[PDB]
Design a protein around this ligand. Structure first.
Ligand SMILES: Nc1nc2c(ncn2[C@@H]2O[C@H](COP(=O)(O)OP(=O)(O)OP(=O)(O)O)[C@@H](O)[C@H]2O)c(=O)[nH]1
Ligand SMILES: Nc1ncnc2c1ncn2[C@@H]1O[C@H](COP(=O)(O)OP(=O)(O)CP(=O)(O)O)[C@@H](O)[C@H]1O
Ligand SMILES: Nc1nc2c(ncn2[C@@H]2O[C@H](COP(=O)(O)OP(=O)(O)O)[C@@H](O)[C@H]2O)c(=O)[nH]1
Ligand SMILES: [Ca+2]
Ligand SMILES: [Ca+2]
Ligand SMILES: [Ca+2]
Ligand SMILES: [Mg+2]
Ligand SMILES: [Mg+2]
Ligand SMILES: [Mg+2]
Lengths: 54, 438, 347, 425
């Protein structure tokens, strides 16, 4: 049961009590993911219109 | 002094954000018009509260906050609400149609077209900082925007602000206050793509807030206002060290250092006490030992689980009010001899403690009663993985039938992203078991 | 109309409980994966406790205590007794035991072993484990340890009771099985009815190679014993006959000489882990049936052998007990439109 | 500002549409001349969803009345709220469709569809943000059936990313106009499986039985049937016309109710349904027992024959929101064998303070139940009964159709039934 690093100031205080010792994707890569999804949306919209055209 | 930028995304993030800033102003003596009498350095200064507020020549204190929602009806509340004068229009960003509880829609479809706009409005705030620490990102797991657009925002923030820290405050889906069925999908999609971009996340389970409101406040059917005023107290206790003088958790980096020794296991459990009803005749003021002891009762945790059957990796005690280190240790000693507190063998069995003498501020006319002392315990338990198990299980029930998947594929997401996300959560559940079980 | 689900088809006990619930016409059984249940008769291994208590407006109850394995595992029980101050290492009703991996208590076991061998004391130990049907009795430490290395699971070596209480006629060993029910409020109900699983072979202290006269398990006596069913039907004597015998032979009663100690042991063990398994302030409720196994020496001192987490029952007592399980454990949480002994204690 | 463009086609579609605009106009405080005369701000909070705002604070419905004969639309224009509809929104021909799907879809209808889309385009171009479209029509006639599905198909072409929702009246021999109704209904159902996101299935037989057995009406009229559709249409559209987060817009509702794209046919339900013992207050338990009772449902299908994929309930009035949750959770927990276990929490409840006219409190039910296959089976059986003999086909081949198109539609609907079945197990 030890208290360490007791820091006191006008508005409060903080300390530590030990009870026992121990024992990314780039900007280009994101535009490609975003544009890939946009493309698949465009493809599924083309098939819809092509189906309505028929 | 270093600045922190708060980002609020979706209905949940925006409404919770509105509640916190209402509370920050009451705490720092700020008025709805932005004036702060106690601030004697007019038009500038590097006080602790300046990490969350900027200052104009007229003496206004402006939150370092951004509100992003793909639909205007909620942010419109802020524009005309009580604190309309605090934020300038650039800080409030809205689309015209929401994501429809569809992660793919908020991340791919609508997110793609509004991402650059948000990043810019954030760049504007960053340009007013002399030493930005990072961001605080509020959002919901279930919402199409809260989930889908946030993960994209996190990915870009890691690109534009690599060395900056990012904390989350995420709302875990609960059926009692939700009307969306696909929230398990969104929760796991967003946790997969956001995991590597978040240094520390505080999950709040609406089921936990709901029960606390029904049990401790005696609200028969709690509203979002009830849930948010309580959530903002917990948030205030967590951000208090960034806004007030102190030596514990004085920057966003110290949150990872003190609470997340393993990067993927960065979901500390939050426990708060006391929560007393303001309608009560008059409550007996609880002691340091009693409120501290309450921190190990499951009934006041932000996520329902059983820490008795996990292992702690870290533990912070944040007190506000009349508390002294003498009474803290006295209570902690008494709790070790009664409670079941097993730490991981590669971590010390210790408690970092912070005390702020200013007791919790309560919104006038709110549901919470004024108390002379309160505490919020931040402990990293493997038991919070129960929240993943539940969520992951609901995901498996629907996905086995491919239910609702067509809505996501229709927005441009590949079906493989579902399994790739689930395979990651399966990996996440294993890391928790490898650390906490024998 | 309450609802329950079954997830352990191999449980004779709760299979009879599921039959009684349906008989009342006020309980409805659902599919094993339907989450909208009031009661769960859960699986023995890896019961998903994390998913209990998260159904709006459903009070959910389960027939197992998360963490009770600490008491129902061979090596776990030894670790619990030596470390828990409420039981202390000097516990007087549990045989000297040691956890031996194939931390580890090898050198501590040999130390106490060497002390007995030097002091002319009876040095007969028994090695066992949880992964058994796999037991070995020997007075040589070399054989015990060598037997454990041949396997691959944790074992326990505890002192063998060389002076057991021998029933007459027959000169035969035995063990007492007590069924104990713990409800959601952590009340401890001892079933008034117990059973002695007796050995049909005369006890022989000069031959630990034939394990039929030393092991009182019901399966071993019915397979390797040739006098099965001679003295009592199925090598099962019940408390009525056992009490009459103690009065004719020893001039005492089963209550005074044994039951008081059994009730004490049951309390001490369960009260110990109450903080770790209590569901008092939890989002779900738990109850569980336990099977305590005791030994009795010729001095009339009771010894705790093990604790079963999913115990079966004696055929003649399934009705009374299972019905009692519904009265105190299930219908107390879900009331409908004593055979137990309450062991009071301080919560 | 999330606007909806309403379309009503054919005789049935227009008589029901007229009553719908009559019912909600009263709820939002709009009078027959379009002048607001309410007393609550909740009335106008979402009024732009269905009403355009013109000069003089006049609210004009965003409805487009369509037909191939003038007869019915002349009744609407002479009806109680006829003067409230935009005069330009009346698009009609003179030939009629003679209860012939092929006429409304391929011949007479095609001649008129272009001018309808000109009005649709006119209304969309003034919407700040268009949610989607809702169409009212019968499937057993010619105009609302043949031309109605023609509009949906052409509206989807021009607005492929907008929600298309319809209230569809299914024909029943008990309430029949002609014997060809099975033919027309079968041909439309295939159009709907393809080109709608949500279709409220309204069976005239259920509406009849309810009027005879429950409402105790000796001889029910089409007007009496339409009173039930009015009340139901007002109920389902409450979440859209008043403030709320549950099923707020049309897309969120479709996302939470439609797990699979082709299984988007709902069973509506309403409570109470009382005969003239009509002033008695109705408690929350009674609203829930009746709301889930098959007798209170309008698809003529016993839900106990199938399983609910998802359920949406809306309670209107000043009541115990706590008592609502307790009763709704009682029905799920006491009949869980009728809810798919592989969709967690598939029963969402919404509450609204404003009750319908002349009622303390009411409840509307929207179920995506696999029992709906019983409805499509009836149609498919009546269809095949005549089609195996090629009876009455000449009316259709004489309009350019080939028998092959009938065989295809038959197969498409039988597939739709086989799809509901595999999810019911
Ligand atoms: N605690 C709390 N939870 C909220 C609040 N608002 C919404 N939620 C929860 O958030 C989840 C839905 O997410 P939303 O925020 O509504 O969705 P969104 O971010 O607006 O994204 P969209 O789909 O485009 O609307 C549900 O589980 C709600 O229970 C709030 O104000 N407080
Ligand atoms: N220390 C000891 N001294 C004397 N006998 C012992 C003993 N340990 C075990 N036994 C004998 O072993 C039998 C029980 O063995 P144990 O309970 O350890 O294995 P097990 O768990 O597979 C049987 P069960 O679970 O049914 O009680 C008893 O009948 C007892 O006679
Ligand atoms: N519920 C209801 N059904 C109707 C009404 N009018 C016609 N129907 C039904 O609709 C079918 C006839 O279609 P109808 O609308 O008259 O054909 P259309 O004018 O060419 O579109 C038959 O099944 C009728 O029973 C009505 O006012 N209410
Ligand atoms: Ca200043
Ligand atoms: Ca980073
Ligand atoms: Ca012509
Ligand atoms: Mg929203
Ligand atoms: Mg055993
Ligand atoms: Mg007609």
């Amino acid at each position: 049961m030890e208290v360490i690093e007791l820091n006191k100031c006008t508005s409060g205080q903080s300390f530590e009590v030990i009870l026992k010792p121990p024992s990314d994707p780039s900007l280009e890569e994101i535009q490609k993911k975003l544009e890939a999804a946009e493309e698949r949306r465009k493809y599924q919209e083309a098939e819809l219109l092509k189906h309505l055209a028929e | 002094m270093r600045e922190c930028i708060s980002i609020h995304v979706g209905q949940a993030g925006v409404q919770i954000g509105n509640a916190c800033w209402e509370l920050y102003c009451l705490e720092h003596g700020i008025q709805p018009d932005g004036q702060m009498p106690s601030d004697k350095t007019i038009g500038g200064g590097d006080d602790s509260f300046n990490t969350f507020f900027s200052e104009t020549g007229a003496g206004k204190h402006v939150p370092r906050a951004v509100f992003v929602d793909l639909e205007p009806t909620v942010i419109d509340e802020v524009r005309t609400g009580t604190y309309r004068q605090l934020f300038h229009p650039e800080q409030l960003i809205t689309g015209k149609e929401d994501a429809a509880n569809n992660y793919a829609r908020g991340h791919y479809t609508i997110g793609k077209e509004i991402i650059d706009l948000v990043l810019d409005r954030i760049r504007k705030l960053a340009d007013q900082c002399t030493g930005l620490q990072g961001f605080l990102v509020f959002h919901s797991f279930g919402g199409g925007t809260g989930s889908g657009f946030t993960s994209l925002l996190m990915e870009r923030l890691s690109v534009d602000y690599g060395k900056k820290s990012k904390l989350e405050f995420s709302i875990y889906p609960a059926p009692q206050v939700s009307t969306a069925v696909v929230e398990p999908y969104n929760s796991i999609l967003t946790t997969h793509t956001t995991l590597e971009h978040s240094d520390c996340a505080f999950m709040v389970d609406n089921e936990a807030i709901y029960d606390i409101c029904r049990r401790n406040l005696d609200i028969e059917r709690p509203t979002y206002t009830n849930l948010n005023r309580l959530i903002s107290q917990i948030v205030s206790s967590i951000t208090a060290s960034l806004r007030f003088d102190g030596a514990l958790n004085v920057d966003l980096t110290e949150f990872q250092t003190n609470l997340v020794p393993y990067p993927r296991i960065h979901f500390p459990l939050a426990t708060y006490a006391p929560v007393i009803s303001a309608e009560k005749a008059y409550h007996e003021q609880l002691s340091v030992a009693e409120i501290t002891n309450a921190c190990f009762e499951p009934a006041n945790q932000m996520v329902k689980c059983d820490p008795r059957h996990g292992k702690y990796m870290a533990c912070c005690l944040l007190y506000r009010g009349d508390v002294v280190p003498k009474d803290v240790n006295a209570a902690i000693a008494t709790i070790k001899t009664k409670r079941s507190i097993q730490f991981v063998d590669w971590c010390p069995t210790g408690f970092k403690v912070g005390i702020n003498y200013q007791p919790p501020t309560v919104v006038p006319g709110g549901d919470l009663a004024k108390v002379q002392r309160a505490v919020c315990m931040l402990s990293n338990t493997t038991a919070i993985a129960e929240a993943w198990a539940r969520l992951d299980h609901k995901f498996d029930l629907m996905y086995a039938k491919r239910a609702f998947v067509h809505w996501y594929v229709g927005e441009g997401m590949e079906e493989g992203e579902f399994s790739e996300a689930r395979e990651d959560m399966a990996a996440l559940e294993k890391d928790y078991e490898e650390v906490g079980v024998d | 109309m309450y609802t329950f689900v079954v997830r352990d088809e191999n449980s004779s006990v709760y299979a009879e409980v599921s039959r009684l619930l349906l008989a009342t016409g006020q309980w409805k059984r659902l599919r094993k994966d339907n989450p909208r249940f009031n009661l769960m008769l859960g699986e023995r291994n890896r019961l998903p406790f994390g998913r209990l208590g998260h159904e709006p407006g459903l009070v959910q109850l389960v027939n197992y205590y998360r963490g009770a394995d600490k008491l129902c595992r061979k090596a776990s029980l030894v670790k619990l007794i030596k470390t828990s101050p409420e039981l202390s290492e000097s516990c007087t009703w549990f045989p000297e035991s040691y956890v031996i991996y194939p931390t580890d208590e090898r050198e501590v076991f040999l130390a106490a072993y060497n002390r007995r061998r030097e002091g002319r004391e009876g040095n007969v130990w028994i090695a066992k484990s949880s992964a058994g049907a796999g037991i070995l009795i020997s007075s040589e430490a070399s054989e015990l340890l060598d037997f454990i290395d041949e396997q691959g699971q944790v074992h326990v070596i505890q002192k063998y009771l060389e002076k057991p209480l021998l029933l007459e006629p027959g000169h035969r060993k035995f063990d007492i099985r007590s069924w104990v029910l713990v409800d959601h409020l952590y009340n401890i109900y001892l079933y008034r009815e117990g059973v002695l699983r007796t050995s049909s072979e005369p006890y022989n202290s000069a031959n630990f190679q034939d394990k039929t006269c030393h092991l009182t398990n019901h399966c071993i006596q019915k397979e390797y014993s040739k006098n099965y069913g001679r003295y009592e039907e199925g090598n099962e004597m019940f408390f009525e006959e056992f009490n009459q015998y103690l009065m004719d032979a020893l001039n005492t009663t089963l209550e005074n000489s044994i039951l008081l100690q059994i009730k004490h042991i049951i309390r001490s063990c369960l009260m110990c882990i109450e903080p770790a398994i209590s569901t008092k302030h939890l989002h779900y409720q738990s109850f569980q049936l336990f099977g305590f196994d005791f030994m009795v020496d010729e001095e009339l001192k009771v010894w705790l052998i093990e604790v079963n987490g999913a115990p079966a029952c004696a055929q003649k007592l399934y009705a009374e007990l299972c019905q009692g399980i519904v009265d105190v454990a299930i219908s107390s949480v879900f009331p409908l439109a004593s055979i137990f002994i309450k062991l009071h204690h301080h919560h | 500002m999330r606007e909806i463009v309403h379309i009503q086609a054919g005789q049935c579609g227009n008589q029901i549409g007229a009553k719908f605009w009559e019912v909600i106009s009263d709820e939002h405080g709009i009078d027959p001349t379009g002048s607001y005369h309410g007393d609550s701000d909740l009335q106008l909070e979402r009024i732009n969803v269905y009403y355009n705002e013109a000069t003089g604070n006049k609210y004009v419905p965003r409805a487009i009345l369509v037909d191939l004969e003038p007869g019915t639309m002349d009744s609407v224009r002479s009806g109680p709220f006829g003067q409230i509809f935009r005069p330009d929104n009346f698009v009609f021909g003179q030939s009629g469709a003679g209860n012939n799907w092929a006429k409304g879809h391929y011949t007479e209808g095609a001649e008129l569809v272009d001018s309808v889309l000109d009005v649709v385009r006119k209304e969309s171009e003034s919407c700040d943000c268009l949610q989607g479209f809702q169409l009212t029509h019968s499937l057993g006639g010619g105009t609302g059936s043949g031309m109605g599905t023609l509009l949906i198909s052409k509206i989807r072409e021009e607005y492929p990313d907008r929600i298309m929702n319809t209230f569809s009246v299914m024909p029943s021999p008990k309430v029949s106009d002609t014997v060809v109704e099975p033919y027309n209904a079968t041909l439309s159902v295939h159009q709907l499986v393809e080109n709608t996101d949500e279709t409220y299935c309204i069976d005239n037989e259920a509406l009849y039985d309810i009027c005879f057995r429950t409402l105790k009406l000796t001889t029910p009229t089409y007007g009496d049937l339409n009173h039930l559709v009015s009340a139901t249409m007002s109920g389902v559209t409450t979440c859209l016309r008043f403030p709320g987060q549950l099923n707020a817009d049309l897309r969120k509702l479709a996302v939470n109710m439609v797990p699979f794209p082709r299984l988007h046919f709902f069973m509506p339900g309403f409570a109470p349904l009382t005969s003239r013992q009509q002033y008695r207050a109705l408690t929350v338990p009674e609203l829930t027992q009746q709301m889930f009772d098959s007798k209170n449902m309008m698809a003529a299908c016993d839900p106990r024959h199938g399983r609910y994929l998802t359920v949406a309930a809306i309670f209107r009035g000043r009541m115990s929101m706590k008592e609502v949750d307790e009763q709704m959770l009682n029905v799920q927990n006491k009949n869980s064998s009728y809810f798919v276990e592989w969709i967690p929490n598939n029963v969402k409840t919404a509450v609204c303070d404003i009750p319908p006219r002349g009622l303390k409190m009411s409840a509307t039910f929207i179920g995506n139940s696999t029992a709906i296959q019983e409805l499509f089976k009836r149609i498919s059986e009546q269809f095949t009964a005549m089609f195996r003999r090629k009876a009455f086909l000449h009316w259709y081949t004489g309009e350019g159709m080939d028998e092959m198109e009938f065989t295809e539609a038959e197969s498409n609907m039988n597939d739709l039934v086989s799809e509901y079945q595999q999810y019911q197990d």
